[PDB]
Structure 1
Amino acid sequence: DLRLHLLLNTSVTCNDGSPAGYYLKESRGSRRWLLFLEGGWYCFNRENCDSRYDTMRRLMSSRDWPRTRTGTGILSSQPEENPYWWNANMVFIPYCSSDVWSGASSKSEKNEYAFMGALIIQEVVRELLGRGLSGAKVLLLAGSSAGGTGVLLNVDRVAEQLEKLGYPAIQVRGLADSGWFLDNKQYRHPTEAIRRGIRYWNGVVPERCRRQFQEGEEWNCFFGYKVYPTLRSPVFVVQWLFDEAQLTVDNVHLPVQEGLRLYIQNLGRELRHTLKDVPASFAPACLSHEIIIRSHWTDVQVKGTSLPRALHCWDRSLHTPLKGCPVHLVDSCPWPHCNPSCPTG
């Protein structure tokens, strides 16, 4: 139900110089716009980007993209599948820049690949303004995995873009799903990959975070607990306490012995600690990865509240806590699937 539009400014490109784009399903009368950033890791040098180009080419090129995509989860237009925003205008922005949505570098003479993630978002917003976004009341920039980190890196830039373009009535907000990572010690054997990626991509981070960390240290701004306090736009954070991608980068692969048990328990407790002062958050004690565009995203609950409900409560809070409509939902139990509603697998 979402139709592909390749960017009219064809200088804003995927990694291989093909045009970037977006999938759109309009909902006339709705003044709510959901722009979702796809995830899918990243690449940070010629050799690993070349490998990703052989066997993950849709993440680097629009040449083979389909005409349409079905909106699922939070992008579904069916209230049964999406109790939260089923009537919104829906936008799916494919991830084809491999740069955690941070890049501002064109393909050229010196560059085999273009890394334009930050410019793709800006150009999508530009072109949507002529398609009804000019009349929006809320623009929710959402994303999963690298797209969730992309929300953190870009939500305030979208807000500033719209202000400078003359649309101060559009409330820009972020929903970062599975993009809140820790730069922690591995269990055996991201920081270095991000440092190199930033140079390779000409990667950009939010201004206030950049001013805190300074040159050479912008990689810090890819870590939610460091960049979030610098952001002005409201951001709702969804993060499994035992995220599979966090565990992968930590070199954990799941009878668990004491060292690994302590490592896993400490990871959950560190994640919980980083979310203590995040007032809009949903952090279930599960071993899993991403949630918001899965068709059964409605099933998980924390303290008896689902994510669609928590997001609805967040909308109400942005009109003092609300009776029976909580927005801060972080599990306190210490082991994967101590929450009975965790995804089964």
Structure 2
Amino acid sequence: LNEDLRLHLLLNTSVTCNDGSPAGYYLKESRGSRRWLLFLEGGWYCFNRENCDSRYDTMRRLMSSRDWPRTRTGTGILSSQPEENPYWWNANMVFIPYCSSDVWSGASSKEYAFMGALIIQEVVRELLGRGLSGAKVLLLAGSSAGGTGVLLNVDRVAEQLEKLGYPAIQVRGLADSGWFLDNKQYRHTDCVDTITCAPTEAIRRGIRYWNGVVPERCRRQFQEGEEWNCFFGYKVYPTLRSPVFVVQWLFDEAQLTVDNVHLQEGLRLYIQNLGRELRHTLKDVPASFAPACLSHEIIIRSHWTDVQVKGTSLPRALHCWDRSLCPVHLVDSCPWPHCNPSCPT
């Protein structure tokens, strides 16, 4: 097929996936478009040697490029089909697979390797030779751990480009399902399994184990040793220099899982309070889209055009935002999961 994204493994083979195989990116160039969409894949993380070994058996794709296919079809925001992607089908499309298990924060060279931030850096620089140097807009986008990666890296990439001599390129971000709360769990549990570890504790261990770096402007706000705060969207958002659009299910499953909810009286309240706290953190975020659904991820799913908030679709909210650089602070007020009719299933 004419329209598939093609795999490029990183020429510098010292920047690697967890297991030492080369990292990489898929690319579909678009004749004539000055819009670049760079997508960071998600899929959790591992914060100790034992959890990582276990992920290596269960989910090897997420720790190695050995079996990556040479092509991939872009879906959602990365689709070249006008019906699937009405404003940006004609964009330069890039998919960066997530094989560092580090929320894209790993920045050192030397057991498992965690080099997420360096993979992004490396992909940006290779792309300059394939046409990124003439871009008007570089949209750094991501889902789940990729979404959080956007927040950790978008200003780093803005700096990388001005340092390399390409200041005219407008760097922006789009974080989907990467906006989490460092809250108290519903029912307590000791941190042992990835999926049920409290978010706060998970990042504390992750950041040390990974040698993870956080954006500089957020790092300065918190004490030495408390860099884990910068993994949380409401804490990193305020000092961002690059513009960022935030897409977040008010009742995100990954959030519920880490809050040790499993799917009552007390639970209803906790859940409904979650939704409320979420809304509160989006109050000063005009570029947001936050439907009251219980779900996780949206932007590279084929059905992303379906969801609406206040009569506006996600592709339309994004296009208006792009144009402002038609409403934009699109947060559902209805208070219980699925109260929005447009939710998916």
Common topology (TM > 0.5): yes
Counterpart-to-counterpart distance in 2, 1:116 and 1:178: 22
Deviation, structure 1 residue 84: 2.8
Aligned to 1:246: 255
Deviation, structure 1 residue 81: 0.2
Counterpart-to-counterpart distance in 1, 2:163 and 2:7: 27
Aligned to 1:297: 304
Deviation, structure 1 residue 327: 1.4
Question: Helix, strand or coil for the counterpart of 2:229?
Answer: helix
Counterpart-to-counterpart distance in 1, 2:208 and 2:265: 40
The more displaced of 117-126 and 206-215 is 206-215
Deviation, structure 1 residue 250: 0.7
Deviation, structure 1 residue 244: 0.4
Deviation, structure 1 residue 252: 1.1
Aligned to 1:191: 200
Deviation, structure 1 residue 117: 0.2
Deviation, structure 1 residue 104: 1.1
Deviation, structure 1 residue 307: 0.2
Counterpart-to-counterpart distance in 2, 1:176 and 1:245: 15
Deviation, structure 1 residue 263: 0.6
Instruction: Show CA shifts across 1:6-59 (max 9, x none).
Output: 001111100011110000000011010000000000001111111111111110
Question: Helix, strand or coil for the counterpart of 2:304?
Answer: coil
Contact 1:26 1:89 in 2 (8 A): yes
Aligned to 1:311: 318
Deviation, structure 1 residue 105: 2.5
Question: Any stretches of 5+ residues in structure 2 without a counterpart?
Answer: 189-198
Amino-acid identity (%): 100
Question: Helix, strand or coil for the counterpart of 1:66?
Answer: coil
Counterpart-to-counterpart distance in 1, 2:143 and 2:7: 20
Aligned to 1:333: 334
Counterpart-to-counterpart distance in 2, 1:126 and 1:9: 11
Counterpart-to-counterpart distance in 1, 2:96 and 2:256: 27
Counterpart-to-counterpart distance in 1, 2:202 and 2:293: 26
Deviation, structure 1 residue 157: 0.2
Question: Helix, strand or coil for the counterpart of 1:184?
Answer: coil
Deviation, structure 1 residue 192: 1.0
Deviation, structure 1 residue 167: 0.3
Contact 1:39 1:147 in 2 (8 A): yes
Contact 1:74 1:85 in 2 (8 A): yes
Deviation, structure 1 residue 214: 2.6
Aligned length, in residue pairs = 331
Out of 29, 49, 52, the residue aligned to residue 49 of structure 1 is 52
Instruction: Show CA shifts across 1:171-218 (max 9, x none).
Output: 000000000000111111111111111111110000011011132100
Counterpart-to-counterpart distance in 1, 2:344 and 2:282: 21
Contact 1:82 1:298 in 2 (8 A): yes
Question: Helix, strand or coil for the counterpart of 2:277?
Answer: helix
Question: Helix, strand or coil for the counterpart of 1:297?
Answer: helix
Counterpart-to-counterpart distance in 1, 2:59 and 2:308: 33
Counterpart-to-counterpart distance in 1, 2:48 and 2:257: 20
Moved segments of 4+, more than 6 Å: none
Instruction: Show CA shifts across 1:108-147 (max 9, x none).
Output: xxx6011000000000000000000000000000000000
Aligned to 2:131: 132
Counterpart-to-counterpart distance in 1, 2:178 and 2:201: 17
Contact 1:40 1:145 in 2 (8 A): yes
Contact 1:74 1:84 in 2 (8 A): no
Counterpart-to-counterpart distance in 2, 1:247 and 1:263: 10
Deviation, structure 1 residue 225: 0.3
Counterpart-to-counterpart distance in 1, 2:173 and 2:45: 21
Deviation, structure 1 residue 97: 0.3
Deviation, structure 1 residue 239: 0.1
Deviation, structure 1 residue 83: 1.2
Instruction: Show CA shifts across 1:209-242 (max 9, x none).
Output: 1011132100000000000001100000000000
Deviation, structure 1 residue 258: 2.2
The more displaced of 70-79 and 188-197 is 188-197
Contact 1:84 1:311 in 2 (8 A): no
Counterpart-to-counterpart distance in 2, 1:26 and 1:70: 13
- After superposition, residues 1-345 of structure 1 pair within 5 angstroms as 1-106=4-109, 112-189=111-188, 190-254=199-263, 257-317=264-324, 325-344=326-345
Counterpart-to-counterpart distance in 2, 1:53 and 1:253: 25
Question: Any stretches of 5+ residues in structure 1 without a counterpart?
Answer: 318-324
Question: Helix, strand or coil for the counterpart of 1:212?
Answer: coil
Contact 1:73 1:297 in 2 (8 A): yes
Contact 1:195 1:219 in 2 (8 A): yes
Deviation, structure 1 residue 160: 0.3
CA RMSD, 1 decimal: 0.7
